[PDB]
Design a protein around this ligand. Structure first.
Ligand code: NI
Lengths: 139, 139
């Protein structure tokens, strides 16, 4: 393990449903405060033993992370992490946006260059993403 | 090695560009014929040492795979993998579409039920996903 996913977080499963095709798990992160929702196939839930108490790694690729200042957009998403932009690197087609989480962690998002022009270091924003944008990995 | 991604394909890097924020790598799969385009951050490219000849594991979550019978949809995407549906499992909200690749591997896609209404076993279809919907893992 070393994956390209720029966001790799420790978490503990605290709930799992039992749909036959796609199930959802609740995951409590290392801060003992942040809660995520993640979808996986029923087969994977069983294979990895994703039951209450199971320790895992959350793999979230940079381009899956949206950045917004709108409360509806953030509350409409499955997951939302507030924080402050610590750095922006502009590029020709994409921009790297780093946001500080109270986590002491740095979240990384890859945002299309045209959509990042209004984003600036120092802004208080919310990072958000779908439950199906996350891969769960077992140590 | 153990992640929820239902598609975990071994391959080797054949090329990597040097774009500043987000770079593209070409991957040749272990079947020696399947080529993929994957986009990763520049830091990841450097950190994982993703250069010609590097062995890697591709992690493609099931919901990131679309299944289409429309060739233009397939062609609009960065990656296209023609195949033959071998099984469809329909849930209330999602459906598991299993597709036989030419080499015999089984590709797994999670597809919203409404997008799977015309799909059936034995049909020729194409699996498709963009370059930024793939994670690269080192062994
Ligand atoms: Ni490029």
């Amino acid at each position: 393990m070393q994956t390209s996913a720029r966001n790799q977080w420790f978490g503990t499963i605290t709930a799992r449903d039992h749909d036959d095709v796609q199930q959802h798990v609740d995951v409590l992160l290392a801060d003992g405060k942040t809660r995520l929702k993640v979808a996986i196939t029923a087969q994977s839930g069983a294979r990895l033993g994703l039951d209450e108490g199971k320790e895992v790694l959350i793999l979230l690729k940079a381009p899956w992370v949206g950045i917004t200042q709108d409360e509806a957009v953030a509350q409409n998403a499955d997951n939302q992490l507030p924080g402050i932009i610590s750095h922006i690197e502009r590029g020709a087609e994409q921009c790297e946006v780093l946001m500080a989480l109270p986590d002491g962690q740095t979240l990384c998002a890859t945002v299309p260059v045209n959509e990042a022009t209004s984003l600036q270091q120092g802004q208080n924003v919310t990072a958000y993403f779908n439950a199906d944008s996350v891969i769960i990995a077992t140590l």
